[PDB]
Amino acid sequence: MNKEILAVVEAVSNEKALPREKIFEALESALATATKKKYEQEIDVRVQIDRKSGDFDTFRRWLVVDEVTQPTKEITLEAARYEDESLNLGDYVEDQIESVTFDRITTQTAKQVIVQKVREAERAMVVDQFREHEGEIITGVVKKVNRDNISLDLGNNAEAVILREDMLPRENFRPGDRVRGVLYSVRPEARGAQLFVTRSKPEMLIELFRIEVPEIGEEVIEIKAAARDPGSRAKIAVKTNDKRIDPVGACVGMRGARVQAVSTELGGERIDIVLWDDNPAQFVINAMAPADVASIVVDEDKHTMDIAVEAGNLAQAIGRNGQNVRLASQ
Amino acid sequence: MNLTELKNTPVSELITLGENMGLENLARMRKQDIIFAILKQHAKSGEDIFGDGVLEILQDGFGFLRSADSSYLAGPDDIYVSPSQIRRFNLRTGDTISGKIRPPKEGERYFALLKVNEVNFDKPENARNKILFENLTPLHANSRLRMERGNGSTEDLTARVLDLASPIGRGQRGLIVAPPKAGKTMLLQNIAQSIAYNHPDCVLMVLLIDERPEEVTEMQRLVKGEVVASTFDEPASRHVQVAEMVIEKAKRLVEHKKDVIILLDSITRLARAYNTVVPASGKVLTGGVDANALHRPKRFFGAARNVEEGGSLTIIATALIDTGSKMDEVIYEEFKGTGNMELHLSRKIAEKRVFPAIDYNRSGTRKEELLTTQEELQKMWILRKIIHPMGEIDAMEFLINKLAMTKTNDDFFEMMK
RNA sequence: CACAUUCCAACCACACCUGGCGUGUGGC
């Protein structure tokens, strides 16, 4: 039987996604489940099946504790001083040997455990490999655009997910196109696809500029703020700590060429490079531009800003659902 | 309406046009069926439709005309052609066809061809009186390809080095031997820019097999040429499909008296795809390789030649080494004595950030006397004799450092004396 | 120009192996 175990551990399909010690622990867990299904009672068994060459030599766990419930895995602290245990937990002794690791039900449960383990393997591997590209934009065709979320093929058995809440009624989907974003959260302890990528976050566009805008990335300029009402308005507020560059003149390109390109990349969303100031007053003055404001007031105890607008430029002051204001408050 | 017009449009413009037509939301689905549905509408109300592409013959007798922007893929964009055309104009695998199309009628989903307007940019009458490909009389390299632009920028010098390391001409077989992380990508990029700038008359094609989509995207919009590629998220079927289609297109085009030059990177990945797509014939080599799995890659590489009757076909395929597998070495050893233009890129120089890392001592070109004049080739011989006793890194150091100040290659030859 | 044989959202199409039997020759 040991020869078959060695053949199995050697001829695994994914030698890179399922490392050798992982095969060892998977076989150990499978044999543990087999031995559990063997006896009528509930007794957990560790295997440690001679990792390199030899066969199995099982054990018997006993869980040192003053309890008695399920006495198969019970050893009281007072009645444990023999065998030189002397401890309070970890009495995994070799009281049990002579397991059968090949019969029908054992082989079936071992195949099932192996499937679960290779799935867990693939998951952890793809997640902790493609998680390095969390701040930078990822590429890849979609697996399937379901209702609650969409799943995207990032490459060799590589998968990501984009949630439904971050989607748009006008943003448009079917298996086979590639939609990008920013990997915003990774939950490696989940039960399935755990590579969560969003598209509505502001820093997205910032990262986007880091691919196109050469002024950003070298710290010579400073992209500070990004007000993003997805589908409505995506404005950016940058700052220049140097003394030979313009905040809006350089990053705009040549009469709406690079900003228009990244707008079409973001979905044709209206993008206006705004210039924030060191004070919130001029900041909200510029965020609601081009328009006039009859009153700018700041309130700290209320955590609010009163912006009263004059009449004459309403068509540029409110817009749709107060979008020109909705970014500022956001 | 032309198909290539909607082809060169981005997806956003197709979405805007579909919304201007007032239909069901088209932005939801593939660019493929996006173009399909907008064409169906505009052809329900519109002129004769026009289209263009490359033809592939099916085992049913009919043929499919596909686009290179979709890298010759199957989909609703394809144009159905009947075997009656393949009897009348005797169509062939890889013919560049452009003609009139119509919507498919009841029960059909593929646009039907009406009348061939241009076959391989040429007359159908003149499409009969043509010469067969292997029936041609191959020859050595007769006309040399000028890669030196004469401006001497930061990257152009790279091409200049080639002009003194291994001269290339129409009909020559180029094979690049380089380990990973050696700078071959922008090497081919600079070469393609130079040969597209110096020779806008010869149709230039590149091939990327199992490449990352980032390089594919940045290449398909920076150089001239039908930049066709094959990303690794598809099986070997698609890769061998691109191989077939573009090699047949190049074959037909040189048969039409045109100089075609094919850029492949890399030949080892394409050969691996060939191996994993070809059925096993019983004979295994070291590393799971079939003996028959190299037959079609050898055909693909040897298709290039210099025709006496007219036109030429030059292939430049790159090979990978030093990456650990068995297949890489067996393939590179099988392909070593095949190409007549070796270009060796040693990683030992690239590790020192000396670009381009070119093994000048282990590189060369056979029959190089038919590309340069007597004094040019003599200066090449004298410089090879000068630089050969030197090592590898110091050799490229001296080469690049002395080509940095002088700006034309013949001036470099003069100053080297 | 012309025949035209299409890469084939729920799902109709992808269902089954086996016994005892038979051939030829001879007999009245």
Side-chain angles (χ1 to χ4, degrees):
Chain A
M1 181 53 186
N2 185 27
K3 277 78 53 183
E4 186 175 6
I5 306 161
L6 296 185
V8 165
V9 73
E10 270 285 340
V12 296
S13 81
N14 300 269
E15 285 90 348
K16 63 94 179 177
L18 174 46
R20 207 58 69 89
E21 79 285 347
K22 207 160 188 174
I23 314 163
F24 299 156
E25 71 209 49
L27 291 178
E28 286 159 355
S29 297
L31 267 44
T33 55
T35 49
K36 169 63 64 60
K37 296 303 176 301
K38 278 176 153 300
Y39 291 160
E40 299 170 339
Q41 289 80 230
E42 286 75 17
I43 177 63
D44 44 355
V45 174
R46 53 167 193 179
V47 189
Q48 306 185 54
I49 169 172
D50 214 323
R51 329 273 283 188
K52 179 56 64 186
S53 43
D55 66 309
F56 53 89
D57 47 350
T58 53
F59 305 91
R60 186 163 182 178
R61 308 175 176 264
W62 288 88
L63 194 82
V64 160
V65 58
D66 296 314
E67 211 165 329
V68 294
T69 56
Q70 190 62 221
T72 68
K73 46 180 58 179
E74 288 276 11
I75 282 295
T76 81
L77 281 77
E78 53 270 9
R81 315 311 301 177
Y82 183 78
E83 292 109 358
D84 190 12
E85 312 173 38
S86 309
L87 82 170
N88 47 23
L89 182 49
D91 49 354
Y92 312 142
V93 300
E94 206 182 70
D95 281 337
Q96 212 296 315
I97 314 102
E98 184 258 346
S99 58
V100 190
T101 79
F102 38 89
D103 63 72
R104 180 57 182 274
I105 181 64
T106 56
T107 310
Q108 300 306 321
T109 190
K111 165 205 62 178
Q112 187 266 350
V113 164
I114 283 303
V115 168
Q116 308 321 285
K117 282 308 294 168
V118 302
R119 189 204 57 244
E120 172 77 36
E122 286 185 5
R123 286 168 172 177
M125 302 311 282
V126 68
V127 163
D128 73 345
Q129 292 331 114
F130 280 79
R131 180 211 33 78
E132 305 288 331
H133 306 91
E134 50 181 7
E136 199 263 325
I137 323 296
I138 71 171
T139 62
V141 71
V142 294
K143 311 209 318 180
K144 207 180 306 301
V145 290
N146 303 330
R147 178 194 68 95
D148 47 353
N149 75 319
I150 74 177
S151 199
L152 310 88
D153 272 317
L154 307 188
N156 47 358
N157 194 209
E159 51 90 13
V161 285
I162 299 183
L163 272 301
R164 171 191 187 84
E165 304 91 357
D166 297 329
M167 302 197 307
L168 215 57
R170 88 183 184 189
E171 180 181 12
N172 281 8
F173 291 109
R174 179 75 76 107
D177 52 355
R178 39 181 37 84
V179 194
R180 303 185 291 187
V182 153
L183 174 65
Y184 72 102
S185 87
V186 166
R187 264 56 164 165
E189 67 280 348
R191 44 80 176 163
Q194 53 206 14
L195 209 65
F196 312 95
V197 177
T198 187
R199 50 135 293 179
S200 296
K201 278 189 176 57
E203 87 287 336
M204 179 68 200
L205 71 90
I206 307 184
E207 304 280 359
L208 288 173
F209 277 27
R210 216 157 304 270
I211 306 112
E212 212 290 324
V213 172
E215 285 88 5
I216 191 58
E218 314 174 12
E219 193 264 333
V220 286
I221 78 167
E222 201 168 9
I223 296 188
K224 201 71 173 184
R228 273 193 70 180
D229 206 333
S232 158
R233 284 220 92 89
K235 291 177 195 170
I236 177 180
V238 306
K239 190 57 65 182
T240 62
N241 63 331
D242 301 1
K243 289 302 172 184
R244 62 178 62 91
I245 48 185
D246 284 319
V248 75
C251 318
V252 73
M254 60 178 183
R255 194 46 256 181
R258 300 160 179 166
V259 60
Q260 180 191 15
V262 302
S263 298
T264 61
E265 191 265 352
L266 276 162
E269 186 174 355
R270 293 186 171 272
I271 295 188
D272 300 325
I273 308 179
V274 77
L275 176 51
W276 72 292
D277 215 329
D278 296 326
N279 47 3
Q282 186 60 221
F283 155 72
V284 295
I285 280 184
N286 292 129
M288 274 160 271
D292 52 357
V293 170
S295 158
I296 288 285
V297 174
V298 60
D299 194 2
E300 211 279 331
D301 216 336
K302 197 60 175 58
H303 288 331
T304 192
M305 304 168 185
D306 308 310
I307 295 96
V309 54
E310 200 70 26
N313 298 123
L314 296 95
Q316 298 171 339
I318 295 180
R320 272 78 68 181
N321 315 306
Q323 46 192 8
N324 297 125
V325 194
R326 187 48 62 106
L327 292 183
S329 44
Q330 198 188 196
Chain B
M1 184 62 99
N2 286 336
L3 175 57
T4 210
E5 296 173 3
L6 272 73
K7 285 202 32 204
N8 291 14
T9 65
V11 66
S12 182
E13 221 205 342
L14 301 166
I15 295 161
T16 59
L17 203 153
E19 295 316 279
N20 286 14
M21 291 303 302
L23 293 137
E24 185 290 312
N25 306 292
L26 295 159
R28 289 298 228 184
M29 320 274 101
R30 205 62 76 104
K31 117 118 181 89
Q32 204 157 55
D33 48 60
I34 275 175
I35 288 183
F36 179 72
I38 316 181
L39 279 189
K40 285 205 69 176
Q41 211 42 12
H42 169 59
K44 265 149 179 156
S45 57
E47 339 207 356
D48 297 284
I49 310 94
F50 285 97
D52 85 301
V54 188
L55 175 81
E56 182 212 50
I57 264 124
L58 276 299
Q59 341 291 336
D60 240 57
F62 74 91
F64 276 162
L65 200 71
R66 302 182 181 188
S67 140
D69 208 338
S70 112
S71 49
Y72 317 113
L73 258 57
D77 52 292
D78 73 326
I79 298 140
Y80 181 90
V81 345
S82 193
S84 44
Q85 286 97 334
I86 319 189
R87 273 203 38 75
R88 189 175 341 274
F89 303 93
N90 269 329
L91 298 195
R92 245 90 70 2
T93 293
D95 306 333
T96 297
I97 310 297
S98 43
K100 176 168 53 185
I101 56 179
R102 70 152 172 79
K105 17 228 202 78
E106 299 58 52
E108 313 283 359
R109 29 174 293 189
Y110 299 153
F111 284 69
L113 191 62
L114 272 300
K115 194 196 47 92
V116 283
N117 308 153
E118 261 144 34
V119 173
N120 310 323
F121 302 150
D122 202 77
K123 189 156 176 176
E125 237 299 356
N126 288 342
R128 223 77 44 36
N129 186 32
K130 74 168 285 187
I131 187 50
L132 255 270
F133 185 80
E134 30 1 299
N135 253 4
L136 291 165
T137 64
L139 209 58
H140 297 259
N142 291 5
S143 73
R144 194 194 171 278
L145 294 166
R146 275 307 170 189
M147 311 305 299
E148 178 186 357
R149 195 183 305 176
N151 48 353
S153 59
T154 298
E155 82 285 348
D156 175 69
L157 51 92
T158 289
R160 292 168 54 171
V161 182
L162 267 75
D163 281 350
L164 27 99
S166 313
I168 210 97
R170 311 186 208 272
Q172 198 79 352
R173 289 197 185 91
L175 168 118
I176 322 298
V177 186
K181 300 193 48 75
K184 55 192 172 65
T185 323
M186 87 289 296
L187 191 138
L188 260 84
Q189 294 172 1
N190 172 39
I191 285 310
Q193 295 147 11
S194 217
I195 188 149
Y197 192 77
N198 301 332
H199 308 281
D201 87 293
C202 59
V203 40
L204 199 57
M205 309 183 189
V206 319
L207 223 32
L208 292 206
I209 309 303
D210 293 15
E211 207 57 36
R212 50 209 53 84
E214 299 89 331
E215 256 148 39
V216 183
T217 286
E218 71 92 15
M219 264 276 294
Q220 80 164 0
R221 58 167 94 184
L222 193 147
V223 308
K224 215 91 38 85
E226 317 244 10
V227 176
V228 74
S230 109
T231 318
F232 51 89
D233 12 56
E234 275 331 358
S237 41
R238 165 157 168 265
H239 314 290
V240 67
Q241 201 56 47
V242 202
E244 305 322 313
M245 283 258 238
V246 61
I247 200 60
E248 289 303 296
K249 182 182 179 184
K251 285 167 123 177
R252 301 300 96 84
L253 265 140
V254 52
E255 280 171 316
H256 270 215
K257 294 168 180 179
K258 285 174 169 291
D259 292 323
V260 187
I261 295 169
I262 269 280
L263 287 177
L264 177 90
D265 189 350
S266 101
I267 203 176
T268 90
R269 294 193 167 280
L270 183 60
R272 174 170 300 176
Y274 268 106
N275 166 262
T276 187
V277 68
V278 69
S281 48
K283 279 286 280 218
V284 108
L285 288 82
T286 60
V289 182
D290 226 286
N292 299 97
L294 298 142
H295 162 255
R296 306 168 68 171
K298 279 173 184 180
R299 286 191 63 254
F300 188 95
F301 190 78
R305 68 205 66 175
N306 179 26
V307 186
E308 198 176 338
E309 290 82 25
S312 170
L313 180 61
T314 282
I315 197 179
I316 310 290
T318 77
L320 319 182
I321 53 176
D322 285 277
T323 208
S325 162
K326 304 229 330 180
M327 219 151 333
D328 23 2
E329 306 358 91
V330 301
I331 284 172
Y332 153 70
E333 194 77 30
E334 272 314 342
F335 284 162
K336 164 182 309 272
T338 65
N340 57 5
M341 201 286 299
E342 22 214 284
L343 187 54
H344 292 282
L345 317 180
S346 110
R347 206 214 304 181
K348 223 233 12 200
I349 312 177
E351 295 198 12
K352 198 179 179 180
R353 215 173 58 89
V354 181
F355 293 97
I358 315 218
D359 202 322
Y360 178 76
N361 304 330
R362 299 188 310 172
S363 194
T365 315
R366 292 95 58 83
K367 297 293 174 206
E368 54 179 7
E369 299 78 33
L370 312 183
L371 296 182
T372 61
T373 102
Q374 200 28 34
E375 320 64 312
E376 260 169 349
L377 150 82
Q378 176 187 2
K379 291 169 180 58
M380 288 183 182
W381 275 125
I382 303 257
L383 220 35
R384 165 91 73 171
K385 181 187 177 180
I386 283 180
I387 309 283
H388 181 276
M390 308 171 58
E392 295 234 340
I393 294 188
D394 59 355
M396 285 301 313
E397 290 217 1
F398 182 86
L399 270 264
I400 255 329
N401 274 150
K402 297 310 167 301
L403 276 136
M405 31 200 324
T406 184
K407 222 134 126 99
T408 70
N409 295 340
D410 196 314
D411 260 283
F412 167 73
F413 283 123
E414 275 159 324
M415 293 267 163
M416 270 288 92
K417 304 174 299 179

